[PDB]
Amino acid sequence: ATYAQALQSVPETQVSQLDNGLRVASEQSSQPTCTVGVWIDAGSRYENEKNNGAGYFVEHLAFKGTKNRPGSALEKEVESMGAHLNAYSTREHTAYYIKALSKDLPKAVELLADIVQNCSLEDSQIEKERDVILQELQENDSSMRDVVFDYLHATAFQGTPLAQSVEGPSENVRKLSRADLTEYVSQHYKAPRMVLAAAGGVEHRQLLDLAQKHFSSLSGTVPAFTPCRFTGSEIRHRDDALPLAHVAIAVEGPGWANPDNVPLQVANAIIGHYDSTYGGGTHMSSTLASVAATRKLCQSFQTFNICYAETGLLGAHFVCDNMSIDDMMFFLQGQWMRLCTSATESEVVRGKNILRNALVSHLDGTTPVCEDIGRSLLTYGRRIPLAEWESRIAEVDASVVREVCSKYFYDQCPAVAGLGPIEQLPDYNRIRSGMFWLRF
Amino acid sequence: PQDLEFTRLPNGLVIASLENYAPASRIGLFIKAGSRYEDSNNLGTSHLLRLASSLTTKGASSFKITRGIEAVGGKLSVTSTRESMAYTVECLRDDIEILMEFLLNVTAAPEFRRWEVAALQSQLRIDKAVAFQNPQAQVLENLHAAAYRNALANSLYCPDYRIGKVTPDQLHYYVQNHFTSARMALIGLGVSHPVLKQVAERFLNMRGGLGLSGAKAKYRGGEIRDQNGDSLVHAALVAESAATGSAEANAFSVLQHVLGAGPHVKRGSNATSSLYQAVAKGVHQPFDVSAFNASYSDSGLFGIYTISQAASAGDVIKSAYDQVKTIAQGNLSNTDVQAAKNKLKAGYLMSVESSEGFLDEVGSQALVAGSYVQPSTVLQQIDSVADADVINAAKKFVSGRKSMAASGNLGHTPFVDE
Amino acid sequence: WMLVADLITLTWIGGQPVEHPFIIIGQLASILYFLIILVLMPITSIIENNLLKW
Amino acid sequence: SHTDIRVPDFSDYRRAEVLDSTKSSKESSDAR
Amino acid sequence: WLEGIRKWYYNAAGFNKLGLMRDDTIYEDDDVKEAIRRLPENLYNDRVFRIKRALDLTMRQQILPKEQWTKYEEDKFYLEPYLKEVIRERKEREEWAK
Amino acid sequence: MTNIRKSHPLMKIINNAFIDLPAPSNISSWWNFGSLLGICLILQILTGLFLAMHY
Amino acid sequence: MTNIRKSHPLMKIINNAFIDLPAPSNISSWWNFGSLLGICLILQILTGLFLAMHY
Amino acid sequence: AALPATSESPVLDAKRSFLCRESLSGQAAGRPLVASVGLNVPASVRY
Amino acid sequence: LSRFLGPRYRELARNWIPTASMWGAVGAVGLVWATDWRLILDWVPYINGKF
Ligand code: HEM
Ligand code: HEM
């Protein structure tokens, strides 16, 4: 088993398609557990200004009682057989997955059929949930990471649905009524926009039979989004009482398509990640992280690759004190243009290995495998096998990384979002000047 | 294909390997050198040893270790509990040999150079501050201090009076007395036994004996209460349940899942959890109650953990406790027992499915039990538990010395005698 | 100190006119002035380091 | 909340090319 | 024998006349401060006092009495083991760089 | 590693002088004359030298 | 509230450049030449000007 | 860790507030604390 | 010094040769333009009429 043989030995993801348009897919294994869930193409990207937050609201209400299962009775099932019911709604995806035993798949799918089709939307339950969402919004206000990322989205995609947050404004939260929720679920939770993923010890034919027996009476056989526009801007929520200063700087990246994602991830793998409670410290190959550990510039930093259907954000997010924002902006831009102008071969090899490890280790356990299945059948349109990922990483070299970074980084207007004691944060002109090198 | 092959080495080592043909392979050296073995003059040494990975070893320098580990893009993570540390390395199955060599250098021939340890000692404060941002860390540390007298009372983190005074000689003595060839388990997922045996014969030759034996962790029953001022009062009241891997341990786990241990449906209502229903009929404010079960080698601790508002905390402590008393006299529906058994069997299987979880489970099995039992055996053992045992369980918890730890605005929290 | 003496020698030679007694002395002085700085001093430093066990 | 804030409209300052929300700006980035 | 020449050069250097030792006179290049920092406490204190005394003597243009001179056989290379490690680490970093 | 602009003492003085000096955003055009004076001075000096070379 | 010598900007520069500058205790007479050149420079300027007024 | 865990370590920084019953679900420790800090991985705690 | 050279430095040199050569061309053109270097300026077509 020389790695490549191990990659070939990974079982494939069989994909089917119901008459209603449900893309039933499954990956068979030998584990005695399973994770089955539907991924829907709803989210804030498909939400208008007045509807903003309806997806989060309906996701909240989904588990709190159905039509056939009144209230906690549904929950009474999930705990009775040891299942873990969970959900998450991204800006472009929504999902409700139920961890269960391999022998509980016939029931679990049934529960899923109840959650997405025969929902309740009880008015009194809506009233109880409204204040809960308000308090959750207040809790997220203290989340200086999520707040900064929402600031980045708003200041990068201003004037487009992508700028909208997942939870939506509090005004919409209090305004939203049952009619809007049922209209939203009837318009977005359509069969062609749903994929019933199931990883673990589930046989694909059994999954197909269950889906045909439960998800049959869905929609027959329309929000298709609008191409959003990137607008290099900046938001400075100067608040000196905050202890640290979260900064996020991004550029218009690629989408789920546009294979340039694979080299680009490698570049991010070169920059890497670091925080105070790390290991080697002033020895890690990342020059950014090594310098940060040497001079203690920050408490954290990361490189994200948020990519949507047609566009996406590529950049970094660092958490540091008030007296070191300028230095880390300098070093981060220096690393970006070092990769842009002369990426070398050894760093590219290290990035390839890091990306290989990320993809391989991320896809362990039934939950990440099922999530990958559901997300890939929506974004890529196909569950990309790990062998294809290996080949695509292998094709990446120094010249490819330099070219792709030049395409996406060099002389590009970034979007900046700072929160906290960000007085040191250089003005947007200085950042944009850092986005190009005079020597080169 | 393949099975978790088990072979105990003559030295005392136990090597178990499972070749699952996964693209990535992990190796965990599990050492029975947790924080329970720290004496009173060396507290916090285990913590620094946990952060002592990647320091310059005998065969590989710190720069070489970091560059080799991360150029492959591998892992070097130390997971320490109150009884057993575990070094873990993860990379592709193609580059496993270098990772194994680095792991064995960092676990078998460490140097603990004076300057390296002096520089590293600052990281203890950062680790403690980051971990203690979660109030549960403070609450659990206080609980362990106020429940066990000598052995398990030692914190997982270096006390503030020892930060900066952890001499390298202390680390060397700790390694020489606890990193013994008869107290460790080299567990490999994604590798083959002959390869793991060659690395076992590679260095893996410390004193080979059983090291410095610990002391039986006597029970205290004390009460540690700190007033940190954050609104959410966390309280935890426990009693000595039983040692791990015993019939009483299984009964106590079943009782934990009867009472309720964490949520299952995200943002649900914990309807099955009897404690949540009992408390909710009282306080109508944001709270969270859950059975807290700890099962160590020598003894254990079963109790209730309640996060509650400052004013309501006492009620949350009272009614929930009364709920347990309701089981003590006997109110356990056999349906509830069956549901809890199903929840336990699930939770176990869904904890084993993950590669990391599988590795930790096999490491703990090798260290404590000395052998490995298939999941079917554990499920059968859980099924063998009867209702009368769960009723022991409740009687033992109710009638015993209760150790309590609290944190928050403790203006109304009841004391142990209340 | 040989370098310093060479500097005074160069000064005196520059003072004097350019005839047979002085031309050769000037050539040797210039060669020595460059040689001490570029060759003799570093090699001598190597010799001293070796002689002092480092 | 952080979600309540929204970027004010700049439509009277923006260049003609980057003025439509339903059109990417990468194409006109080179021209600008 | 070569040791005679080494003794002659040691006596001619004259840093022993100030009470200094070999490693007390090494030029502090970038490796040298790192090597010094790693020195144990007692060696560092002795080194700093010896250098302070040497500076005191040179300010008055005086030397130690003949009795208190560091003899060539008593001279210790306290810094040498640390300097070798620092240089080796720098060489390893350079080799990984290329 | 340190930024040469903020670490080199000469470049440090230049940086604190007119590179990263915090200046008010609303200073009118009337402040520009300050720089003009210096500019004029420099120009004057140059011309002065080229006048002192034939006078 | 504070000594002018190390609070006034020009006085601070003069203080930490000529008054409170930490210098080695055993610098020989040769180091003195560093001052002399500077003094010579002034002596070259101050005298030289007085030649320029009749040359 | 190719992956930078999930939540990083912002020392000298406030934790995520609370104040909702649903958000406070199952925060009550049920298993003994274990800590995991290592080379090229953010530190984590699990109970 | 010999501490340089090796694998990593040669592709750095290769990557920066195009930019360095373009900067050298910039310097050459700026020099010939600044001093009005005749020798080159009796060859470029339209500027021949300057002289
Ligand atoms: C502070 C800046 C200066 C000012 C305001 C200034 C002013 C003047 C003025 C008003 C004149 C008379 C011009 C005329 O009547 O035609 C003059 C002449 C002259 N200045 Fe300056 N000057 C300055 C700097 C200098 C410097 C630095 C030098 C020497 C390098 C210099 C050398 C001369 C000479 C040689 C003349 C005589 C030539 C002439 O009068 O046209 N000046 N200067
Ligand atoms: C760097 C320092 C200086 C040096 C080394 C220097 C050197 C000289 C020398 C060697 C002479 C020839 C003297 C003679 O042959 O009689 C001279 C003359 C002169 N220098 Fe300077 N000088 C300096 C500074 C200055 C300054 C600052 C000025 C202007 C203020 C100046 C103005 C003159 C003038 C006007 C003369 C001619 C007077 C005469 O005939 O001696 N010098 N200088």
Contact between B63 and E89 under an 8 Å Cβ cutoff? The reply is yes
Report the run of H or E that residue A13 belongs to, with start and end. strand A13-15
Kindly state the tokens that stand for A342: 């002369």
CA nearest neighbour of A355 among B28, B24, I8, H8: B24
Please provide residue A320's backbone torsions phi and psi, each rounded to the nearest 5 degrees: -145, 170
Three-state DSSP class for residue A257:
coil
The span from the first CA to the last CA of chain E, in angstroms, equals 42
Q: What is the tally of helices (H) and strands (E) in chain H?
A: 0, 2
Task: Give me the residue label for tokens 């793998």.
Answer: A269
Q: Which residues pair with A28 in a beta bridge?
A: A200
Distance between CA atoms of residues H11 and B127, nearest Å:
9
Q: Within 10 Å of residue B152's Cβ, how many Cβ atoms?
A: 28
CA distance H11 to H7: 12
CA distance A11 to A34: 15
CA A349 to chain CA centroid, nearest Å: 26
Cα(B103)–Cα(B88) distance, integer angstroms = 8
Kindly give the number of the ligand 2 atom that is closest to the alpha carbon of G47.
Answer: 30
Min Cα distance E84 → chain I (Å) is 18
Pull the structure tokens for residue A43: 């989210």
Site of tokens 């005998």: B58
Which residue carries 């349906």 as its tokens? B335
Tell me the C-alpha distance between A179 and H32, whole Å.
47
Residue at token pair 């099922």: A370
Residues of H in contact with A143 (CB under 8 A): 16
Best residue among G44, G47, G53 to mutate for probing ligand 2's pocket (most ligand atoms within 8 Å of CB) is G44
CB A52 within 8 A of CB A176: no
A231/A252 Cα distance (integer angstroms): 9
F22: Cβ contacts below 8 Å, ≥ 6 apart: none
Distance (angstroms) between ligand 1 centre and the Cα of F34 equals: 21
The distance from CA E4 to its chain's CA centroid, rounded to whole angstroms, is 21
Strands A13-15 and A25-28: antiparallel
- Report the distance separating Cα A229 and Cα B320, nearest Å: 55
Residues that constitute the known binding site of F for heme b: 31, 34-35, 44
CB neighbours (10 Å) of residue I16? 15
Please state, in angstroms and rounded to a whole number, the distance separating the CA atoms of residues C7 and C9.
5
Atom number of ligand 1 nearest to Cα F40: 2
Experimental method for this entry? cryo-EM
Tell which residue, B97, B101, B13, B112, has the closest CA to residue B53.
Answer: B112
Cα(C17)–Cα(A282) distance, integer angstroms: 65
Q: Which residues contact A12 (CB under 8 A, 6 or more apart)?
A: A27, A383, A385
Residue G29 CA to residue G9 CA, distance in Å, equals 32
Number of helices followed by number of strands (H, E) in chain E: 4, 0
Strand order in the sheet with B223-226: B223-226, B403-407, B233-239, B300-308, B288-295
Burial of B2 (0-12, 13-18, 19+ CB in 10 A): exposed
State yes or no: is A423 an active-site residue: no
CA quadruple A279, A283, A286, A289: dihedral positive or negative?
positive
Residues of chain A found within 8 Å of residue B24, distances taken between Cβ atoms: 357, 360-361, 364
- For residue A435, the distance in angstroms to the closest alpha carbon of chain F comes to 16
How far is it, in rounded angstroms, from Cα B155 to Cα B142?
Answer: 9
DSSP of A136-177: HHHHHHT-HHHHHHHHHHHHHSTTSGGGS-SS--HHHHHH--
- Residues I30, I35, I39, I43, CA torsion sign: positive
Cβ neighbors of C21 (< 8 A, separation 6 or more) are none
C-alpha span between D19 and D21 (Å, rounded): 7
Give Dmax (Cα) for chain G.
53
G-chain residue closest to E52, CA distance: G25
Neighbours of E2 (CB within 10 A): 8
Tell me the C-alpha to C-alpha distance, in Å, between residue A210 and each of A23, A204, B380, F49, I38. Answer: 13, 10, 30, 96, 88
Nearest to A78, CA basis, from A37, A32, A29 = A37
Q: Given the structure tokens 């002659």, which residue do they identify? A: E8
Of A279, A284, A300, the CB nearest to H9: A300
Rounded (10°) CA dihedral A3, A4, A6, A9 = 180
Mutate to test the interface with A, among D1, D15, D30 (most CBs of A within 10 A): D1
Classify B342 as helix, strand or coil. helix
List, in sequence order, every residue forming a beta bridge with A33; answer none if it has no partner: A101
* CB atoms H16 and A276 under 8 Å: no
The CA distance from E45 to the nearest CA of chain G, in Å, is: 19
What is the DSSP code (8-state) at residue H17? P
Task: Count other Cβ atoms within 10 Å, centred on residue F29.
Answer: 6
User: Cα E25 to the chain's mean position, in Å?
Assistant: 5
Q: Which residues line ligand 2 (CB under 6 A)?
A: G 44-45, 48-49, 51-52, 55
Counting CB pairs under 8 A, whether chains F and H reach 3 or more, is no
**Structure tokens belonging to residue B7:** 């072979």
**B67 and chain E: CB distance < 8 Å anywhere?**
yes
Q: What is the dihedral of CA E85, E90, E92, E98, to 10 degrees?
A: -170
The residue to which tokens 């050894």 are assigned = A346
Instruction: Give the dihedral of Cα atoms A418, A423, A427, A431; nearest 10 deg.
Output: -60
- B289 to B234, B278, B294: CA distances (angstroms): 10, 10, 16
CA distance A104 to A35: 10
Radius of gyration, CA atoms only, chain A: 23
The encoded tokens of residue E82 equal 């640390």
How many Å apart are CA B123 and CA B51, to the nearest integer?
A: 8
Read off the tokens for A188.
Answer: 């977005």
Identify the active-site residue in A27, A47, A49, A59.
A59
3-state SS of A321-379 is: CCCCHHHHHHHHHHHHHHHHHCCCCHHHHHHHHHHHHHHHHHCCCHHHHHHHHHHHHHH
Q: d(Cα B284, Cα B134) in Å, to the nearest integer?
A: 25
Q: Sign of the CA dihedral B159, B160, B165, B171?
A: positive
Burial (Cβ within 10 Å: 0-12, 13-18, ≥19) of residue F34: exposed
Of H3, H4, H9, the CB nearest to A299: H9
Residue B416: what are its φ and ψ, rounded to 5°? Answer: -60, -35
Under 8 Å between Cβ of A311 and A228: yes
Q: Can you give B235-298 as a three-state secondary structure string?
A: EEEEECCCCCCCHHHHHHHHHHHHHCCCCCCCCCCCCCCHHHHHHHCCCCCCCEEEEEEEECCC
Q: What is the 3-state secondary structure (H, E, C) of chain G?
A: CCCHHHCCHHHHHHHHHHHCCCCCCCCCHHHHHHHHHHHHHHHHHHHHHHHHCCC
Chain B interface test: which of A86, A287, A357 (most B C-beta within 10 Å): A357
Q: Which atom of ligand 2 is the closest one to the Cα of G51? A: 35
**CA neighbor of A287 nearest in space, from A359, A344, A353:** A344
Distance G54 CA to ligand 1 centre (A): 19
| Structure tokens that stand for E56 in this block | 């005191």
Q: Compute the distance between CA of residue I9 and CA of residue A345 in angstroms, rounded to an integer.
A: 10
User: Could you give the CA distance from residue B183 to residue B210 in angstroms, rounded to a whole number?
Assistant: 6
C-alpha to C-alpha distance for A305 and A321, rounded to whole angstroms:
24
Helices B334-352 & B375-383, crossing angle to 10 degrees? Answer: 170
Half-sphere exposure in the Cβ direction for B177 (13 Å, CA): 16
Residue identified by tokens 């590669």 is B355
Q: Which residues of B touch H9 (CB under 8 A)?
A: 126, 130
Separation between Cα atoms, residue G15 and residue G18, nearest integer Å = 6
DSSP states along F16-43: HHHTS----TT--GGGHHHHHHHHHHHH
Distance of residue I8 Cα from the nearest chain A Cα, in angstroms: 7
Q: How many residues are present in chain A?
A: 440
A166 contacts A154 by C-beta, under 8 angstroms: no
Q: Distance between CA atoms of A196 and A211, rounded to whole angstroms?
A: 8
CB nearest B63 (choices: E37, E40, E92): E92
Helix axes B355-364, B334-352, angle to 10 degrees: 110
Residue C40 is given by DSSP the state I
Q: How far is residue B180's CA from residue B51's CA, in Å, rounded to a whole number?
A: 19
Q: Could you say which ligand is closest to the alpha carbon of residue G48? A: 2
Q: How many CA atoms lie within 13 A of A119 on its CB side?
A: 25
Sequence-distant (6+) residues with CB within 8 A of E46 are: none
Rounded to the nearest 10 degrees, what angle do helices B313-329 and B247-259 cross at?
130
Residue B171: C-alpha distances to residues A262, B109, B178 (Å): 44, 12, 10
Which chains are within 8 Å of H by 3+ CB pairs? A, B
Q: At what angle do helices A105-116 and A204-214 cross, to 10 degrees?
A: 40
Residues H35 and A346 sit within 8 Å (Cβ to Cβ): no
For residue A384, give Cα distances in angstroms to A119, A201, A212, A363, B92. Answer: 33, 20, 25, 12, 19
Query: How many Å lie between the centroid of ligand 2 and the Cα of residue G54?
Result: 13
Name all residues whose Cβ lies below 6 A of ligand 1: F 44-45, 48-49, 51-52, 55
Using an 8 Å CB-CB cutoff, list chain B residues near H31: 292-294
Cα–Cα dist A135/H21, whole Å: 9
Query: How far apart, in whole angstroms, are the C-alpha atoms of residue B135 and residue A420?
Result: 24
Residue pair B195/B161 in contact (Cβ under 8 Å)? The answer is no
Two tokens, residue A84: 């873990």
Which structure tokens are listed for G28?
A: 């020989």
Which tokens belong to G20?
């409170």
Q: How would DSSP label each residue in B15-68?
A: EEEE----SEEEEEEEES--GGG--TTSTTHHHHHHHTTTS-BSSS-HHHHHHH
Spatial neighbors of B322 by CB under 8 A, at least 6 apart, are: B278
Cα→Cα distances B108→B29, B59, B180, Å: 10, 10, 9
The torsion defined by the Cα of B166, B172, B174 and B180, in degrees rounded to 10, comes to: 160
- Within 8 A by CB and 6+ apart from A392, the residues are A259, A262
How far is the C-alpha of B186 from the C-alpha of B367, rounded, in Å? 10
- The single-letter code of the amino acid at B320 is A
